[PDB]
Amino acid sequence: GMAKKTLILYYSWSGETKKMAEKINSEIKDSELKEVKVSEGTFDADMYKTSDIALDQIQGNKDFPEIQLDNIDYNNYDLILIGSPVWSGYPATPIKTLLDQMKNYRGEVASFFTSAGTNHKAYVSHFNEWADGLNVIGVARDDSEVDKWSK
């Protein structure tokens, strides 16, 4: 058979990327919205902790927390969007592990950012460095280039 499906993975707290993800599921034929959780924290305090500062996993740390999600096989979709914050160049490493699972994907990679306060141009170049082995076709903010990450 055949079907180009789409998928939207969006890492952030309850509110942040939620608004910016739910729209896109509704602008694309045969798209969907899945969760990116993290490992760790949990038994540390009342709730998790593995994001309490921006520049954690970058400079002074290097080792980073793992990801969690459901039993999803990227091979069953043809288009994959990725959503995350930015404020000092690259202060997150959620997508790192996921990109390294996607090694046998067939289809297209885009990665929308939902932040720009002091860091725009850097992130575009920085994401390249931390993806460089998957097929990327655009790197923009918001949902204003989804019309090509589909066509």
Which residues belong to the annotated binding site for FMN? 12-14, 16-17, 86, 88, 114, 116-119
Domains of the chain: 1-151 (3.40.50.360)
Which residues belong to the annotated binding site? 12-14, 16-17, 86, 88, 114, 116-119
Pairing of strands 79-84, 108-110: parallel
CA distance 5 to 19: 21
CA distance 132 to 139: 13
**Count of CB atoms within 10 A of residue 52's CB?**
9
Q: Where are the beta strands (DSSP E) in the chain?
A: 6-10, 33-34, 37-38, 67-68, 79-84, 108-110, 112-113, 136-138
Amino acid at 68: Q
CA distance 86 to 42: 24
